[PDB]
Amino acid sequence: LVDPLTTVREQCEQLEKCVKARERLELCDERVSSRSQTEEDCTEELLDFLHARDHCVAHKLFNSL
Amino acid sequence: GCVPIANAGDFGGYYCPCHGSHYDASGRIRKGPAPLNLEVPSYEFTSDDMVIVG
Amino acid sequence: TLTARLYSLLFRRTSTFALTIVVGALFFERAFDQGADAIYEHINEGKLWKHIKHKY
Amino acid sequence: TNIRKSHPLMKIVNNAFIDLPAPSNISSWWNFGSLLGICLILQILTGLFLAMHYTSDTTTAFSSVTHICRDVNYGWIIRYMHANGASMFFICLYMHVGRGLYYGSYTFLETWNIGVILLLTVMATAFMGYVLPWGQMSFWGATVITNLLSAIPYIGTNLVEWIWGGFSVDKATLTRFFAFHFILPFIIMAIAMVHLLFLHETGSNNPTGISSDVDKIPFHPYYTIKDILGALLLILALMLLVLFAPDLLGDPDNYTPANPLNTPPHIKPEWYFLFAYAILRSIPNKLGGVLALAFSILILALIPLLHTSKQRSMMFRPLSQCLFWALVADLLTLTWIGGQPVEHPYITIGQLASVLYFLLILVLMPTAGTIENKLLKW
Amino acid sequence: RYRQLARNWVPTASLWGAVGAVGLVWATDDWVPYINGKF
Amino acid sequence: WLEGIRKWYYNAAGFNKLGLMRDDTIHENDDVKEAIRRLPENLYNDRVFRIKRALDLSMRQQILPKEQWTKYEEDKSYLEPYLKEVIRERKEREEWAK
Amino acid sequence: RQFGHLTRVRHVITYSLSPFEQRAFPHYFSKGIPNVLRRTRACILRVAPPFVAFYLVYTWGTQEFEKSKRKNPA
Amino acid sequence: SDLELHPPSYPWSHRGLLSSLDHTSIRRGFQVYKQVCSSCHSMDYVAYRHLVGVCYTEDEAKALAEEVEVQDGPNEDGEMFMRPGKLSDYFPKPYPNPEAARAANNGALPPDLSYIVRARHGGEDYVFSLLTGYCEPPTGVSLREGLYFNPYFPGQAIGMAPPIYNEVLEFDDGTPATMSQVAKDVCTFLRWAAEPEHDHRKRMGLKMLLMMGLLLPLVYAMKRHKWSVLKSRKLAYRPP
Ligand SMILES: CCCCCCCCCCCCCCCCCC(=O)OC[C@H](COP(=O)([O-])OCC(O)COP(=O)([O-])OC[C@@H](COC(=O)CCCCCCCCCCCCCCCCC)OC(=O)CCCCCCCCCCCCCCCCC)OC(=O)CCCCCCCCCCCCCCCCC
Ligand SMILES: CCCCC/C=C/C/C=C/CCCCCCCC(=O)O[C@H](COC(=O)CCCCCCCCCCCCCCC)COP(=O)(O)OCC[N+](C)(C)C
Ligand SMILES: CCCCCCCC/C=C/CCCCCCCC(=O)O[C@H](COC(=O)CCCCCCCCCCC)COP(=O)(O)OCCN
Ligand SMILES: CCCCCCCC/C=C/CCCCCCCC(=O)O[C@H](COC(=O)CCCCCCCCCCC)COP(=O)(O)OCCN
Ligand SMILES: CCCCCCCC/C=C/CCCCCCCC(=O)O[C@H](COC(=O)CCCCCCCCCCC)COP(=O)(O)OCCN
Ligand SMILES: CCCCCCCC/C=C\CCCCCCCC(=O)O[C@H](COC(=O)CCCCCCCCCCC)COP(=O)(O)OCCN
Ligand code: HEC
Ligand code: HEM
Ligand code: HEM
Ligand SMILES: CCCCCCCCCCCCO[C@@H]1O[C@H](CO)[C@@H](O[C@H]2O[C@H](CO)[C@@H](O)[C@H](O)[C@H]2O)[C@H](O)[C@H]1O
Ligand SMILES: CC1=NC2=C(COCC2)C(=O)[C@@H]1c1ccc(Oc2ccc(OC(F)(F)F)cc2)cc1
């Protein structure tokens, strides 16, 4: 059994706007990952990523429920 | 407003689990959101081994 | 005109104008309730208990 | 001869509301007085019904209200009405005060100061009513605000503890606030009687600001129909909220029972006090903030003396009109600020808005009156 | 001239100020002997 | 010049659009009441009318045709002489009572 | 004071018509739309400016709160 | 922490101005509370009776009531006993007090769910995106243990373990029990629980809009009629 949410999440990640926040997350993973002494997290970049995905999800998801 | 847990925290006094605040043994806020230090009431030490808070 | 017929029949005497209004409110209450109800329950087809209750 | 003119009781009602010479030309802005009366009756009725079902014990109170909303017949609509009702009352109040300022109605001094008192009295009422459900906002709101009277030197601490009837807002405070909240509307009715009594000595102002004795008209039927129309529009509005958006003007924390151990993330009073909250919050010092909060309201009482214009109404006063709308927008801003957490940039927006407010009333609009006078060769 | 040649409410408002002082002090309840001087 | 601004202001004010003159718009305190009370029949009835007119227009949310607007140049201070003297008189009684 | 001794008026003729002789809405749009435009042009430069400034101070300050809650590279 | 992710806006079947709750969805959502949430979370303001006419027949509701053990007031001896529930009983508290609830949840108290839709900004949108929003921390984030990462919560560290996933329960109607489907249904029930009146209110809204459509032009017409005497009048100044 496939949750239609995980389907639609994947479809939404296709979108241009999403890919741009995905890049932002990628750059931040490198950056925090590679240092051993500073205090950053990538919450910010993740959150605006989810924001773009989830506004997309909302439009479509409900159809198939 | 939560209840700090005693004998805990970066400052070995009080650590809030909630938004992560660190009070010293003096109760003074050291590391966390908590605007001001812990609330020091009005006490008197009735007997050598008795205290009254109020 | 229709309105003329109404004026002379119903509205001239004030006792009659009142009798009109109570009787008409009666039929209006029933009519308006029934119609608005049907409007709501068609706007909300399927979603009301009274639409699904046959199942239980 | 004629009963309406003779009979001791009917005479009054006739003189007050039927044969009263009204100006020909009062606008929709004169609707608000009647509407305020309606607001007041509305609250009393809905209030009375609620009070047949509510309890003012800390333990039972939150649930008694929700019981109204779940298990009392039509209790829900009544409750939401009394709550949106309170908003509609403050809208009517602020519109009404607006007209006072713009059209120079405040020249009617006795009428006006009674009115200031009406405002204060309705404020007290709504403050204490909001506590009655015993939600998170109710409780923490009532605590912060009453505590300001602690900043009164010498007596502050004692005074706040006597209001409370203990060491915090607790059982005794709620039971007394219920009592006060019940009797206050009654006193508002009498003050309002008096409010009218003084108005009836002068008759009404009008938008031109120019005396209208040469063109008065009997109140009934011109203004009977027109008030009714206005009341419909008030009802349209009230019920739009109650039936489509009952929670639009409230805070959700007020669905979470009052808890003396867990303080809400942002504490605010109801929207109709936000401008004054924001003025208070602008001042660093606590007694400073208190006196500013009090002055933001009591200043109403001074505006009569600050009038400079040779013309009564702002109709023909362009510079004054601009300043008036500035004040209005500023109060919208003060409200926005008061709903916001104390952070940049809002701290500084608020400070500015607070300055602007007092600046307008005490210095700018007096000046403008005078500049206008010179522009007219008087 | 004639107001200032009033100022005859100055000695009367002196006595009214003592009524206000002593009145607030009575309603509210040390250095007056007997009364409260002996709690 | 000063007069350039004053003329702009007059049109902005807009009482002229109702066929009022400046003196019609003065707020009536006791001094003004009395000045009106000393107005001769011509000048009094004229004022009565201008105001009836304006009030009736205010009701309708209407103005006059521009042709009919009170002209800046033609607006005489009908009231000032009556009023200047009412005030001179008052100031005198004040003086006296000190 | 009641109708009868409000004030003293001379030489003014008032002509009017029963409501039952007349339309409730004479030329409601054809006269009314133009009149409403006229009314609005008259006031908007007094009324609208403040609300523009509100919208701006609110736009700006809301987004200044946005920005300050983010991190910046340092 | 002190950041954002405010919920997006899902097109609920009851978002629309005149749109009622989907009662079938409420029925399923009750099930989701009953089988999943009710282990930790109270809902003190609902009784078995309240389900009647909403999502359950009267005896269906009675069945559901009989399934639970509730304490009853002192008998002859002056002792407390247990019994099967009736319609008249409120949905039972999972623990006898809040402190007990805390001990059982690593010191966190699960909020009662009666009003939860109503007492959180975003309501259904918030709660839906909460249940379906659980993700693995971003790079650099380490939460105290037994507190989970959820971008929709204040601070992003929530003391609730993800309660919802595919086939977490069985549906009376047999609707595909996918994670998103169960989060929808429970939300629908949570809206109804917070605001039983939702449908009645919306019906009245319609009737109020209709009556006002009639009454506003009507009274407005009455106004214009009376005032026509005055609106029409022409003035004439005629000195000798
Ligand atoms: C850049 C992008 C971003 C944008 C932001 C930047 C902003 C830029 C634009 C600038 C905006 C600010 C400036 C204001 C507007 C410009 C000036 C202007 O208004 O010119 C009017 C101007 C005023 O005429 P005037 O002769 O100079 O003086 C008026 C007289 O004093 C008396 O007139 P009267 O005696 O002939 O009586 C009629 C009068 C009556 O006036 C009054 O009594 C005032 C108030 C009552 C309204 C009218 C009665 C209807 C009842 C309304 C409520 C019922 C329920 C409906 C739902 C409410 C809506 C939320 O009606 C009006 O004048 C209508 C104006 C009402 C404006 C209300 C302001 C909206 C509040 C928003 C607050 C902000 C927060 C938002 C949050 C949302 C809510 C939770 O003249 C006309 O337009 C003609 C007037 C006749 C009306 C024409 C047709 C309109 C129909 C009226 C009924 C509906 C009104 C709408 C009410 C609510 C809407 C939300
Ligand atoms: C029966 C038990 C009720 C107990 C409480 C007492 C209530 C009083 C009346 C109740 C029953 C309804 C009958 C109404 C009587 C008829 C009204 C009337 O007789 O007088 C009208 C006043 O109403 C108008 O304006 C009306 C327009 C404005 C809207 C106000 C209408 C009031 C609605 C009545 C409320 C009913 C209460 C129900 C409670 C369960 C007069 O209008 P017109 O000047 O154009 O007519 C001119 C006269 N011609 C036409 C005969 C020549
Ligand atoms: C004119 C000079 C201006 C100078 C002012 C400078 C400040 C110094 C004055 C001190 C006296 C203060 C007494 C009046 C109360 C003012 C504060 C106030 O508005 O209080 C009301 C209750 O009304 C009440 O408490 C009042 C209810 C009835 C009492 C009648 C008061 C009579 C005064 C009227 C004058 C014409 C409550 O409102 P809040 O809940 O605090 O508002 C919430 C805002 N966050
Ligand atoms: C402690 C109390 C503090 C002080 C009180 C402040 C009061 C709060 C304000 C509420 C609004 C008050 C209304 C004032 C009177 C209205 C004057 C008016 O209508 O002016 C219009 C323009 O109208 C228009 O443009 C009408 C548009 C109406 C605008 C809506 C107001 C926004 C609400 C803000 C809420 C915080 C011009 O009318 P007139 O000069 O009479 O000329 C008519 C045509 N010849
Ligand atoms: C002394 C008598 C007082 C009576 C006041 C007269 C009101 C005059 C104005 C009326 C506005 C017209 C719009 C009203 C819509 C009414 C439509 C309707 O039937 O709605 C009611 C609820 O509405 C409602 O409940 C809406 C009613 C809105 C009235 C509120 C204003 C008065 C405040 C009352 C506070 C004490 C119930 O509908 P249902 O539950 O379907 O019942 C079916 C029919 N019985
Ligand atoms: C420290 C922080 C500061 C931020 C404050 C934010 C809140 C308030 C902000 C701005 C309000 C500004 C209002 C200015 C507009 C006035 C000019 C104008 O547009 O209209 C003038 C009115 O004349 C006149 O009225 C003559 C011009 C005189 C206007 C005085 C301006 C003072 C406004 C207040 C500023 C706080 C001309 O229009 P009308 O005469 O109606 O005729 C139109 C056809 N010409
Ligand atoms: C015990 C394992 C739980 C089960 C089963 C469910 N929930 Fe829960 N929940 C639990 C705790 C300890 C908390 C407090 C969280 C904290 O950070 O302190 C919660 C909280 C919620 C909330 C509140 C979200 C908020 O903004 O505060 C909601 C809306 C919530 N829980 C819903 C919920 C639903 C719908 C469940 C069944 C589908 C459910 N919970 C099960 C513990 C437990
Ligand atoms: C000016 C008049 C009044 C105003 C402004 C007013 C205002 C308020 C307000 C704001 C509340 C909180 C509403 C809420 O959010 O729940 C409230 C509650 C209440 N009021 Fe009033 N009220 C008034 C008159 C009355 C009267 C006369 C009574 C009773 C005689 C009354 C009884 C109640 C009761 C019982 C509650 C608690 C129930 C509830 O919260 O809705 N009110 N009032
Ligand atoms: C419960 C609150 C109030 C009620 C019930 C009330 C009632 C009324 C009524 C019926 C009128 C006449 C109708 C009108 O002109 O609008 C009126 C006029 C007036 N009120 Fe109020 N009022 C209240 C509050 C206030 C307040 C707070 C003020 C001022 C701060 C005020 C000042 C005035 C003034 C100046 C007038 C005369 C307006 C004019 O004729 O131009 N009132 N009031
Ligand atoms: C503009 C200069 C260039 C460098 C700074 C660039 C950032 C943008 C300008 C604002 C700088 C922030 O610095 C400052 O912080 C304080 C503290 O919250 C806030 O300012 C406030 O401080 C305290 C708040 O308790 C008040 O007493 C004070 O009256 C008020 O100005 C403002 O937010 C801002 O004036
Ligand atoms: C008198 C009066 N003069 C003027 C105007 C308009 O300007 C001219 C003067 C009015 O609009 C009015 C007015 C005021 C109230 C009202 O309806 C009531 C009555 C009583 C009531 O309960 C209360 F408790 F207050 F008594 C509630 C509403 C109708 C008309």
CA D207-D208-D209 angle, 5° bins = 90
Element (H, E) at H81: strand H81-84
Closest residue of chain G to F62, computed from CA coordinates: G35
Pinpoint the alpha helices (H) of H132-197.
179-194
DSSP state letter for E36: T
Look up tokens 């500049």; give the residue. D371
Element (H, E) at B44: strand B43-44
Closest CB from G10, G14, G24 relative to H235: G14
Phi-psi region of H178 (alpha: psi -120 to 50; beta: other; left: phi over 0): beta
Report whether residue D231 contacts ligand 11, using a CB cutoff of 6 Å: no
Pinpoint the alpha helices (H) of chain D.
3-6, 8-17, 32-51, 61-70, 75-103, 109-129, 136-147, 156-164, 171-202, 219-244, 274-282, 286-298, 318-338, 346-359, 365-375
Report whether residue D235 contacts ligand 5, using a CB cutoff of 6 Å: yes
Q: How far is the CA of D158 from the centre of ligand 3 (A)?
A: 19
B17/H144 CB distance under 8 A: yes
Residues of H in contact with B17 (CB under 8 A): 107, 144
Q: How far is the CA of H69 from the centre of ligand 6 (A)?
A: 72
Chain F, residues 67-96, CB within 8 A of chain H, namely none
| Rounded CA separation F73/F16 (Å) | 11
Q: Whose CA is nearest to atom 26 of ligand 5?
A: H208
User: Taking every pair of C-alpha atoms in chain D, what is the biggest distance, in angstroms?
Assistant: 73
| Rounded CA separation D32/D227 (Å) | 9
What is the number of the ligand closest to the CA of D23?
A: 11
Structural domain count of chain D: 1
Residue type, D310: K
Please indicate if any CB of chain F lies within 8 Å of the CB of D222.
no
Please tell me whether the peptide bond between H98 and the residue prior to it is cis, using omega within 30 degrees of 0. no
G39/F61 CB distance under 8 A: yes
Q: How far is the CA of D33 from the centre of ligand 9 (A)?
A: 5
Query: Any bridge partners for residue B31, and if so which?
Result: B22
**Coil/strand/helix, residue F46:** helix
- For residue B15, give every residue at least 6 positions away whose Cβ sits within 8 Å of its Cβ, in sequence order, or none: B4, B5, B8, B9, B21, B22, B23
Q: Are D353 and D330 in contact (CB under 8 A)?
A: yes
**Coil/strand/helix, residue H176:** coil
Report whether residue D317 contacts ligand 4, using a CB cutoff of 6 Å: no
Please indicate if any CB of chain H lies within 8 Å of the CB of G13.
yes
C-alpha dihedral sign at D137, B3, H103, H98: negative
CA H22-H25-H28 angle, 5° bins = 155
| Rounded CA separation D346/H195 (Å) | 35
Contacts made by residues H206-215, CB under 8 angstroms, sequence distance 24+: H206/C36, H206/C39, H206/C40, H206/H18, H207/C32, H207/C33, H207/C36, H208/D239, H208/D240, H208/D243, H210/C32, H210/C36, H211/C32, H212/D232, H212/D236, H215/D232
Closest residue of chain D to H111, computed from CA coordinates: D256
DSSP state letter for A15: S
Chains linked to A by 3 or more Cβ pairs within 8 Å: G, H
Q: Are H6 and G69 in contact (CB under 8 A)?
A: no
CA G62-G66-G67 angle, 5° bins = 120
Q: How far is CA G10 from the centre of its chain?
A: 35
- Nearest to D256, CA basis, from H115, H190, H97: H115
Active-site residue, B22 included: no
Q: Are D311 and D317 in contact (CB under 8 A)?
A: yes
**Coil/strand/helix, residue H237:** strand
Can you spell out the DSSP letters for B3-23?
Answer: -PEES-TTTTSEE-SSS--EE
Look up tokens 């013309």; give the residue. D311
A58/H166 CB distance under 8 A: no
| Rounded CA separation D250/F19 (Å) | 49
Q: Are F35 and F84 in contact (CB under 8 A)?
A: no
Q: Are D306 and D362 in contact (CB under 8 A)?
A: yes
Q: Are F18 and F54 in contact (CB under 8 A)?
A: yes
Q: Which whole-number Å values give the CA distances from H216 to F38, G20, H208, H221, H227, in the listed order?
A: 49, 21, 11, 8, 16
Extract the tokens encoding G54.
Answer: 């509100």
**What structural domains and CATH numbers belong to chain G?**
1-74 (1.20.5.210)
DSSP state letter for C12: S
DSSP state letter for H10: -
**How many residues are there in chain F?**
98
- Nearest to D108, CA basis, from D48, D44, D196: D196
Query: Any bridge partners for residue H70, and if so which?
Result: H83
Per CATH, H2-196 and H197-240 having the same topology is answered no
**What structural domains and CATH numbers belong to chain F?**
1-98 (1.10.1090.10)
Q: DSSP strand E in H126-232: where?
A: 148-149, 157-158
Q: How far is the CA of D344 from the centre of ligand 10 (A)?
A: 7
Q: How far is CA D318 from the centre of its chain?
A: 28
**CB-based burial, B16-26: b 16+ in 10 Å, e otherwise:** bbbebbbbbee
Look up tokens 């230090």; give the residue. B37
Query: Nearest CA of chain F to the CA of H234: how many Å?
Result: 9
**Coil/strand/helix, residue G67:** helix
Q: At what resolution in Å was this solved?
A: 3.5
- The ligand 8 atom nearest the CA atom of D270: 10
Chains linked to H by 3 or more Cβ pairs within 8 Å: A, B, C, D, F, G
| Rounded CA separation D290/D283 (Å) | 9
- Domain E1-39 in CATH 3.40.190.10? The answer is no
Query: Nearest CA of chain H to the CA of D304: how many Å?
Result: 34
H231/F49 CB distance under 8 A: no
H40 marked ligand binding residue: yes
Q: Is A40 exposed, middle or buried (0-12, 13-18, 19+ CB in 10 A)?
A: middle
List the catalytic residue out of B6, B19, B49, B50.
B19
Query: Nearest CA of chain G to the CA of A45: how many Å?
Result: 10
Element (H, E) at H217: helix H198-232
Please indicate if any CB of chain G lies within 8 Å of the CB of A30.
no
Q: Which whole-number Å values give the CA distances from D255 to D114, D136, D306, H114, H121, in the listed order?
A: 36, 7, 44, 9, 11
Closest residue of chain D to H219, computed from CA coordinates: D229
Q: Are D354 and D292 in contact (CB under 8 A)?
A: yes
Domain ranges of chain H: 2-196, 197-240
Element (H, E) at A4: helix A4-13
Report whether residue C17 contacts ligand 2, using a CB cutoff of 6 Å: yes
Can you spell out the DSSP letters for F76-93?
Answer: --SSHHHHHHHHHHHHHH
Q: Which whole-number Å values give the CA distances from F6 to D121, D338, F15, in the listed order?
A: 45, 41, 14
Closest residue of chain H to D236, computed from CA coordinates: H212
Phi-psi region of B9 (alpha: psi -120 to 50; beta: other; left: phi over 0): left
Can you spell out the DSSP letters for C14-52?
Answer: HHHHHHHHHHHHHHHHHHHHHHHHHHHHHHTTTTSHHHH
What is the domain extent for residue D316?
A: 1-378
Ligand 2 pocket mutation, candidates C10, C17, C20, C22, criterion most atoms within 8 A of CB? C17
Radius of gyration from C-alpha coordinates of chain D: 22
Q: How far is the CA of D348 from the centre of ligand 10 (A)?
A: 8
Closest residue of chain A to H6, computed from CA coordinates: A51
What is the number of the ligand closest to the CA of H28?
A: 7
- The ligand 3 atom nearest the CA atom of D124: 22
CATH at D356: 1.20.810.10
Q: How far is CA H170 from the centre of its chain?
A: 21
Pick out the residues of the known binding site of D for a ubiquinone.
Answer: 200
Closest CB from F49, F59, F60 relative to H237: F49
Chains linked to D by 3 or more Cβ pairs within 8 Å: B, F, G, H
Residue type, H118: R
D19/G3 CB distance under 8 A: yes
Pick out the residues of the known binding site of D.
Answer: 82, 96, 181, 195, 200
Cβ < 6 A, ligand 1 pocket: D 27-29, 233, 236-237, 240; F 61; G 36, 39-40, 42-44, 47-48, 51-52, 55
- Nearest to A6, CA basis, from G20, D306, H135: H135
| Rounded CA separation H205/G61 (Å) | 37
Extract the tokens encoding D206.
Answer: 């009008």
- The ligand 2 atom nearest the CA atom of C13: 51
Q: How far is the CA of F65 from the centre of ligand 4 (A)?
A: 27
| Rounded CA separation D135/D61 (Å) | 9
Fold of H197-240: 1.20.5
**Coil/strand/helix, residue D217:** strand
Please indicate if any CB of chain F lies within 8 Å of the CB of D221.
no
**What structural domains and CATH numbers belong to chain C?**
1-56 (1.20.5.260)
| Rounded CA separation D250/D246 (Å) | 8
Q: Are D209 and H178 in contact (CB under 8 A)?
A: no
Angle between helices D171-202 and D156-164 (to 10 degrees): 100
Q: What does the CA dihedral D202, D207, D209, D212 come to, rounded to 10 degrees?
A: -50
- For residue A65, give every residue at least 6 positions away whose Cβ sits within 8 Å of its Cβ, in sequence order, or none: A4, H180, H181, H184
Extract the tokens encoding G36.
Answer: 């409403």
Task: Tally helices (H) and strands (E) across chain B.
Answer: 0, 6
- For residue D308, give every residue at least 6 positions away whose Cβ sits within 8 Å of its Cβ, in sequence order, or none: D366, D367, D368, D369, D370, D373
Interchain touch C–A (≥3 Cβ pairs closer than 8 Å): no
Residues of D in contact with G68 (CB under 8 A): 343-345
Task: Tally helices (H) and strands (E) across chain A.
Answer: 3, 0
Closest residue of chain H to B4, computed from CA coordinates: H107
DSSP state letter for D97: H
Superfamily grouping for domain H2-196 = Cytochrome c-like domain (1.10.760.10)
| Rounded CA separation H200/H151 (Å) | 35
Please indicate if any CB of chain H lies within 8 Å of the CB of F49.
yes
| Rounded CA separation H4/H9 (Å) | 15
- For residue D14, give every residue at least 6 positions away whose Cβ sits within 8 Å of its Cβ, in sequence order, or none: D4, D5
Angle between helices D219-244 and D8-17 (to 10 degrees): 80
Residue type, H71: Q
Active-site residue, D226 included: yes
- Nearest to A2, CA basis, from H32, H37, H172, H181: H181
Report whether residue G61 contacts ligand 6, using a CB cutoff of 6 Å: no
| Rounded CA separation G10/G13 (Å) | 9
